[PDB]
Design a protein around this ligand. Structure first.
Ligand SMILES: [Zn+2]
Ligand SMILES: [Zn+2]
Length: 217
């Protein structure tokens, strides 16, 4: 499959895209972000693999950035696959307590730093991690960049079909989606794991898709 792709969205914000064959989904296209604060870089989700995580880190290190931290939006390997490699490279990995518990229960390597707060500032006034409640998974988080008004919704934002329901909470997802819309109505751009980038209406599309999925279940 192709190497990880890196594309600039705007000043200090990049999209990383990685490709992996996942049993029952074929080749999955996965987006995350890299956020720059001066010469510091933060990875919003890891690629699926150590290989792609290393390519991503190398691209930024080669351009004079230090990787100061990573946040995984949920426990699935499309957000966490690179944690083990990042830990081995002394790059601080972060996950919620819930995510780390789910990683431990699935026999996976944990993030080294964890937090329990609903709202966690990875970087004061620059990178907010927010737990809207269960949806795609029990632990799913979003990341908000207040300067750019960019929301990374990870695998919670599902404007055109919910995807993998294996670990999903269909009962909670509509409530969690309304919490997200209430928190980030000012979003200019919503980047998702698997969908086209869009405006704040993608949070309303997600709420509609969660309602539809619950009703059908
Ligand atoms: Zn997932
Ligand atoms: Zn996913």
């Amino acid at each position: 499959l192709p190497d990880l792709k890196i594309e600039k969205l705007e000043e200090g914000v990049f999209v990383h895209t990685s490709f992996e064959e996942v049993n029952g989904w074929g080749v999955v296209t996965k987006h995350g972000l890299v956020v720059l604060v001066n010469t510091d870089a933060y990875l919003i989700d890891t690629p699926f693999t150590a290989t792609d995580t290393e390519k991503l880190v190398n691209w930024f290190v080669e351009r004079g950035y230090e990787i100061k931290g990573t946040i995984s939006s949920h426990f699935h390997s499309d957000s966490t696959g690179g944690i083990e490699w990042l830990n081995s490279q002394s790059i601080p990995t972060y996950a919620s307590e819930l995510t780390n518990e789910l990683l431990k229960k699935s026999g996976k390597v944990q993030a080294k730093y964890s937090f329990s707060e609903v709202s966690y500032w990875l970087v004061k006034n620059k990178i907010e991690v927010f737990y809207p409640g269960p949806g795609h998974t029990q632990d799913n988080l979003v990341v908000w960049l207040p300067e750019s008004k960019i929301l990374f919704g990870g695998c919670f934002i599902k404007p055109h079909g919910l995807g993998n329901l294996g670990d999903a909470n269909l009962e909670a997802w509509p409530k969690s989606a309304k919490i997200l819309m209430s928190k980030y109505g000012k979003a200019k751009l919503v980047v998702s794991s698997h969908s086209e980038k869009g405006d704040a209406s993608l949070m309303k599309r997600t709420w509609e898709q969660a309602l539809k999925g619950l009703k059908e279940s």
